[PDB]
Symmetry: D2
């Protein structure tokens, strides 16, 4: 037998950082969960019980805190790139670092119509994420994403004209509820190293904001022919607005809301045009994915 | 042996309702999870296998949908009271109904600074809840709550002057992070029946909004001496603003963020006045409760 | 305003203890999650910012570890009673301690038909729990429970003869699936203090084992007329076997498995006597409760 | 823009099947959660709103139940292969099916030392899983796994001789707790189609049992030099016992249990050789992965 692939490190490292402006008194907080996995010339730790090649996962944890102390933690694309580069430069035998960051929302509170200097609210479990792969001699690959963005529209969704055969019971519809949890990922062109990542810093927050805005607007405004057709429109627009993105991937559950026939009870009308009360279905759910790239 | 207490019913009934304004085209959605448990002269179903006394839990589920079709579902205090009253009036042998409702957020989307007519976002897992107990000949008892409101302040929290003995290692502090998930419940004076609940309908949404506003403002503005002292201030204000409330209860975790001493690494300073990077602790957590009533 | 009730302490304190037999080499592990909440003359911490009355929750955490070091942690009824008694005896102004313990399963592994001396498996998320309330001058009240015991029987469950009215669609049945997650609690007669709890130590593990055995056997063997009738049989037997128990409470979800009509597809028969494939329903669920005491 | 990749289908389809032996009266239950995603000539549904190419996800759900009715559901490798093959053969334009199955435990109850004919218990949240990829003209690729197997050993784990630099605080140890949740996957050689899968049916359950047995025995018996070294031993043995497996992958968290220094309290000794009470850490955790193949 032989080791075909190996990676190891520390998962679920929770980190909080505060920035304090002495001038204005304003404080800003960042909270993330970080995972770092390393690869390199480490097979002997598996095959020969040779621990001399192991950077302890406890040390990886320490390094995350030290790096957060000495560097900006925003945008997460930059922080992940700094963190990953550290490992491949510091350790001769480590040749790849894989950094995943989940950013948690701490939104400044408005109190009496004024932004509060040091108080924050978690407005939704929506996350902003990054995956950064730093590979010695091959640069830095960054995938940015948003996830956990949950939306619903109560009309202006249709689904008709699908394949009908002996397995089909679904009725065509011209008016239904559409609800989903959005997972959207944009993949950046490969960067040569940290200097190039630094040169593009302003694009990271801007592109996240664009991706979010395009998602919300298209969802709200499209008279949707299917999840497939609407998601494609989203992806097309993001690629049009940021030339440094190579691909956009969406993964979308179709969270079903079923009509409830109440006609058995006193002829009560609650279907089609008369539908008012629905039963949200926890499972099963449709799952629709697509990756859109350039011609 | 004897049956000392019994209740039974249907839990986790998900319900969605849409309201459509024909004039304006504007649609509004409500989504809830409902539980209804009944009590009454039902002991023989347990002791003698006498099912004749059982209103099937499946029928309770049907009744929830039918009631939602025929009545407003907002405010939840009113809907719960209608639903509970139904069971005690319809069935001679049922003498109490216990209705719990969790309301899920569907907030109208703003697209290009305009409220969208039929598109919604789940902004946070914060819930608005009601517990309604309808007891034949004893009226309607309603407890209203908000839960899952997660907040953090990065300064203006202190904790010093506590008891110190041979079990104590905690250092006094004049500047710490304070973060919690707020669970706040206000208990209404007993109502004689549905007519009285109806007469107070406007107070329900208003008092929820007040409770939320008081919680957020007090948290942000109090230079907190402890969770105990700040929570008491919240409760006092709510009781002052709504005379029909008898008690206010808060239950608050103290979600700890620990300093990280980095001085072992190149004398790096990250404690006290120099603290920038902290480690959020998933567990254990403080838990502080209090019920405040009138003198 | 006035403080009507208050309690505070530390939740989610994870504790592991190992016992090592020097003679045999055999090791035994215990893992629990502990919550301790205190009550007493502490209102001034809420109303006057007087922290002098507060035993810090951090100190409560320390006390849990110290108590675990110096005392047996099994049975949990005894450990909870020791822990609770400590607080009311040590602090003059603390008059009640409320201790909740969840015990996690670590079952010794059998390797080649032999019990292994120091290796363990988590066989199911079933828990054994205790709630101990120690109240100065009123003794020790203990509620013991098992929870998270998930079972299913594929036949020998019936449900017919229930109330049928204009809200009813449920068909009577003489053969259905019955599945539940068992939550069962037995409440001990009040104990005068720690000496009395100590005198009954052997009864605690024995009664837990009896409660578990009675639950499983009755579930498997009863040709069940309803969840109500079967649960009552369980409770009756437990009360018959342990005279020091005052009440037994069961809380049981009815986790539904629905038939799937496939006759639309090539006349395929999958209902009634021909039912083979079913759809487990995540929600809603029936919820049936009962408390059984002595005549 | 262009569609670079697309797949869609139904997730979280819960399925239960019962087998009834008329001769013996013995009943056996199977419960699974199934996901099916399709690929093929479907880009026009995304780009042109052409639904004619879409097999509705609702129809995929129906097909899962119909297939379960007409075929054995065990071993899951066979059921997944039947299900996947169905889609690529039935629909000309569908060229790949991806089937994921999670099997839930329903273990027959022993009552008074006898196996009960129709009563079952969920003994642990451990799962047996399959991923089956059926690709037109390229055969059937099957990955089998077990997951959620949670174990702990209280001694006979060491970790010393790792890299020490200015980022390292971890002390070397010759005696520690080791606990993990095992995720192990074995990848079968590619099969030409359903006939070949059928020919190997007995190997599927046998290899699952071997993988489980090897995992448990090696964990219990290895005087572990690291998670890396012990996991490699597991993988090596599985590859030695089943020639039709090409690779074995393990992914293992290192769930830390920390010593608690209690010496501040009355010189209490609870570290090193005197360690009895430990603090389980919820996060962070080490994460160690490896894929082992043949020389
Ligand atoms: O078994 C271990 N492997 C590792 O890589 C490691 N790093 N810290 N502790 C550890 N334990
Ligand atoms: O056992 C049952 N008890 C009930 O009360 C009930 N209601 N519907 N199905 C039921 N099954
Ligand atoms: O606000 C607090 N209240 C308390 O009771 C406490 N105990 N430790 N830290 C604390 N913080
Ligand atoms: O938008 C949809 N896309 C689909 O593929 C589908 N299948 N059923 N319902 C559906 N809705
Ligand atoms: Na390197
Ligand atoms: Na009545
Ligand atoms: Na006392
Ligand atoms: Na095909
Ligand atoms: Xe951070
Ligand atoms: Xe969508
Ligand atoms: Xe609703
Ligand atoms: Xe607070
Ligand atoms: Xe313990
Ligand atoms: Xe039951
Ligand atoms: Xe199944
Ligand atoms: Xe391991």
């Amino acid at each position: 037998s032989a080791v075909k692939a190996a990676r190891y490190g520390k998962d679920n490292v929770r980190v909080y950082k505060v920035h304090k402006d002495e001038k204005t008194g304003v404080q800003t907080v960042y909270e993330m969960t970080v995972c770092v996995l390393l690869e390199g010339e480490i097979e002997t730790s598996y095959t020969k019980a040779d621990n001399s090649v192991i950077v302890a996962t406890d040390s990886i944890k320490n390094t995350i805190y030290i790096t957060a102390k000495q560097n900006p933690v925003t945008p997460p694309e930059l922080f992940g790139s700094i963190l990953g580069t550290h490992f491949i430069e510091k350790y001769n035998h480590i040749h790849a670092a894989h950094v995943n960051i989940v950013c948690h929302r701490w939104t400044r509170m408005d109190i009496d119509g004024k932004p509060h200097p040091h108080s924050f609210i978690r407005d939704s479990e929506e996350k902003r994420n990054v995956q950064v792969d730093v590979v010695e001699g091959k640069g830095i690959d960054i995938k940015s994403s948003l996830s956990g963005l949950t939306v619903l529209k109560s009309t202006n969704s249709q689904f008709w004209g699908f394949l009908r055969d002996e397995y089909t019971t679904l009725k065509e519809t011209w008016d239904r509820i559409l609800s989903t949890d959005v997972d959207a990922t944009w993949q950046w062109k490969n960067f040569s190293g940290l200097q190039e990542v630094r040169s593009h810093v302003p694009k990271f927050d801007a592109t996240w904001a664009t991706a979010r805005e395009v998602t919300l607007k298209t969802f709200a405004e499209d008279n949707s022919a299917s999840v497939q057709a609407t998601m494609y429109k989203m992806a097309e627009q993001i690629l049009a607005r940021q030339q440094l993105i190579e691909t956009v991937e969406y993964s979308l559950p179709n969270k079903h809301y079923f009509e409830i026939d109440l006609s058995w009870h006193k002829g009560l009308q609650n279907t089609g045009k008369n539908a008012e009360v629905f039963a949200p279905q926890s499972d099963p759910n449709g799952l629709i994915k697509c990756t859109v790239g350039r011609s």
